[PDB]
Structure formats: C-alpha cells, structure tokens
Amino acid sequence: MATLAFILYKYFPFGGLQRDFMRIALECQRRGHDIRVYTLIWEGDVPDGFEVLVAPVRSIFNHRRNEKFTAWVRADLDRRPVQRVIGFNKMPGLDVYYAADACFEEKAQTWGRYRHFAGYERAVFDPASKTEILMISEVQQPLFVKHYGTQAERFHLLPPGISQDRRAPANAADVRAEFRREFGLEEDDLLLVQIGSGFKTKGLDRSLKALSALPKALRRRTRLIAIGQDDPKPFLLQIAALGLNDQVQILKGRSDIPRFLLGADLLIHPAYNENTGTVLLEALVSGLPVLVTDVCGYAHYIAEADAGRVLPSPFEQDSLNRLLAEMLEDAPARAAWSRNGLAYADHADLYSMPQRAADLILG
Ligand SMILES: O=c1ccn([C@@H]2O[C@H](COP(=O)(O)OP(=O)(O)O[C@H]3O[C@H](CO)[C@H](O)[C@H](O)[C@H]3O)[C@@H](O)[C@H]2O)c(=O)[nH]1
C-alpha cells in the first residue's frame, strides 16, 4: 500500500502544529500517497482524499484518553497496515515524529500525568526507539540528547514552512488600507496584534500591561487585537481593571491572518515559552515589526534580520513596557524594521519545510 498514516491528537485550522501537518500531508499526497489521519478531534474542512478517523475513546483524564487512543490506533493499523506512520504528538509506534513540541522532561525540571508524558516522550526519544525525528527548533535537540541520549543521526533539522499567502503581495498597500478602513483605524492610530491560540503562555497578560503602561500620548493612539481559538473570558477582568475596554479586542480563530499582518503596526509576542513561533516569521515576511521574548525558538530570526526587537531574559514587565514605548515612539526605526523584514524574506529559505519533510518521510 502507499497509505501514509498521520497521527495528531487534535486537528483544527488555527494552530501551528495543525497547519504544518496539513502542508506535509498535502505534499506527500501530491507525491502519490493516500492519506489516513488518526485523531481525537477534527475541526474544519477535510481535504479531498483524506481518510480521517476520529477515535471513539473516552476518559476523564487526558493522559489516559491518550493511552486509549494509542491502543485504538494500533489495533486499526494491525488490521489495515500502512507504508509509514508519522506522528505530530509524542507516542509509541511512530516511524517519524515531527517535533512540534519542546522537550517535556526539560520543562518538567523547572504524578500520573508526568509519568504518562515522560513515558510517551521516551517512547520516541529512547536510544532503542527507531523513530526518526524532524526537528524545527534547533535549540531543543541538545535537550532531547541530554534527557534521553538519542543518537545524532536520528535528528533532521527542517527550515521554516511559512505559507506563500503570508508574503507581502503586490497589492499590500490596498489590503492594508481596506483592513484599516474596516477596523476604523486612521493614519495616526497604532495597532498591536497578538496572534495565536494560546493566549496565556503567549503572554497576552504581559501585552495588556505594556499597553496600559504606555505614556499618555502613545496610550491614546494605540489599540490591541488578540486573535486565537481561545477563551477571552479570563482576560476580561484584567482589561477592565487596566481601563482598556475601549482599546482591546479579542477575536476567535481567523483564516485572514495576512490582512491583520499587513494592517497592524507591531506584532507583540512576549511569550512565556514558545517552541518556534510561526507568527514571528509571518510578521517578518509581511513587513510587520516584531516585539518578542528571547525564549521563542524563532526570536533569533527577528534579531538577525533586524526586523524588530527581542526582549532578553529574565522577563521584567518594566523592560517590556519601556521597549514597547521605545518601538512605538520611533517611526523611522519601525519603517527600517519593516524594510528589513521584507528584504530578509526575499533571501532566506523560510518556505521549504513541507518539501524537505516529505523528502525525509518518503526517502
Ligand atoms: O486565528 C488564527 C491563529 C493562528 N493562525 C495560524 O496558526 C499558526 C500558529 O503557529 P505558531 O507557531 O505561531 O503558534 P502555535 O502555538 O499555534 O504553534 C505550535 O506549533 C508551531 C509549529 O509546529 C511551533 O512549534 C509553536 O511553537 C507551537 O506552539 C500560524 O500560521 C498562524 O498564522 C491562524 O491561521 N489563525
């Protein structure tokens, strides 16, 4: 058979892991392979030719639900074999694992849950495992080796896989204008965007503080839009307390991210932690200056392209506050950062991930 089985716990269109999966699966499909997907949930369109299997397993604890998932999948595969098994979450029985997550053991070293997630990571990374690993954050490889001793030859570093529709188009100025008209933004207004479905760990709380803390002249001109498949309710108290009710909107998952990237004035991403941060590069290729914490795996790109500022660790609210103020005050610097991002996008390989992953998956 030429069937490839792709395994991920959750498909939905507004996540990095999920979009990377989709691009790899579509590339492998174009190369003559039918696609089977095993998942706990599939939200949104199913592409032609994808055989999507949603597990009927249930458990009160997610970690136990995941083990039941593995048994369910392995029983299906035993009955209906495939050419290769590619997982986007850590579990036993993968031929290939795409490391969309950072090293768990490292995070834990900051009971049933811990043992499950450590055991599933070990199932991939143990030296007796045969799983081949597609890395997307370079910084994580030494940590997997530290914790499991994984052989060097099993790791394959991929370049970024930013989709084409995020690159600034020929009519960028028209898209910007139409966006700003729609949202009621005038030339003297400043729009911050915080993009990604995980507002807490991506530091929406720090973004709101920095917005609140701006000097009066900037604070009056500036608004924030957060975009993600995430609950806004927990931030509403903070927004009211900071007096920002009229300056902040939180939207659900959107498929028109490129319009926000062209229409905004800064991307703010002061994440607590972030394996890579695709949105960081999407801002860069859009010419949108970025303010990001150094812990993000893709932060180095912002620094090296000089397409915004990276805030060094340890995190201090006061430094974020000050950096945001300094970036919004300096319109020449923002114009340079924008130019720098666009020029870097024309030279650097930020696009080829799905082809490279497919080459490794299929030999
Ligand atoms: O409303 C939304 C919100 C997000 N996105 C898209 O979803 C992706 C988000 O990817 P990020 O890496 O920025 O963030 P995630 O947290 O969703 O992604 C996860 O997987 C990534 C790639 O596999 C990285 O490893 C990352 O650190 C990890 O948290 C981007 O293409 C972004 O444009 C949308 O299309 N619509």
Residue numbers in the entry: 0 to 109, 118 to 370
Reported in the publication:
The glycosyltransferase WaaG in Pseudomonas aeruginosa (PaWaaG) is involved in the synthesis of the core region of lipopolysaccharides. The hexosyl sugar residue in each of the bacterial species is transferred by a glycosyltransferase (GT) referred to as WaaG to form an α-(1→3)-linkage. The PaWaaG monomer displays a typical GT-B fold, consisting of two “Rossmann-like” β/α/β domains.
For the PaWaaG-UDP-galactose structure both monomers have unambiguous density for UDP-galactose. Interestingly, structural comparisons show that, while the galactose portion of PaWaaG-UDP-galactose superimposes perfectly with the galactose component of GalNAc from PaWaaG-UDP-GalNAc, it occupies a quite different position to the glucose moiety of PaWaaG-UDP-glucose. In contrast to the glucose sugar comparisons, superposition of PaWaaG-UDP-galactose and PaWaaG-UDP-GalNAc with EcWaaG-UDP-2F-glucose revealed that the twisted conformation observed for glucose in PaWaaG-UDP-glucose relative to the EcWaaG structure is not present. Instead, galactose and GalNAc adopt the same overall position and orientation as 2F-glucose. Interestingly, PaWaaG was also unable to hydrolyze UDP-galactose, despite the crystal structure showing that the sugar binds in a very similar way to GalNAc. This may be due to galactose potentially being quite mobile, as evidenced by the significant Fo-Fc peak around the anomeric carbon of the sugar, which is not observed in our PaWaaG-UDP-GalNAc structure.
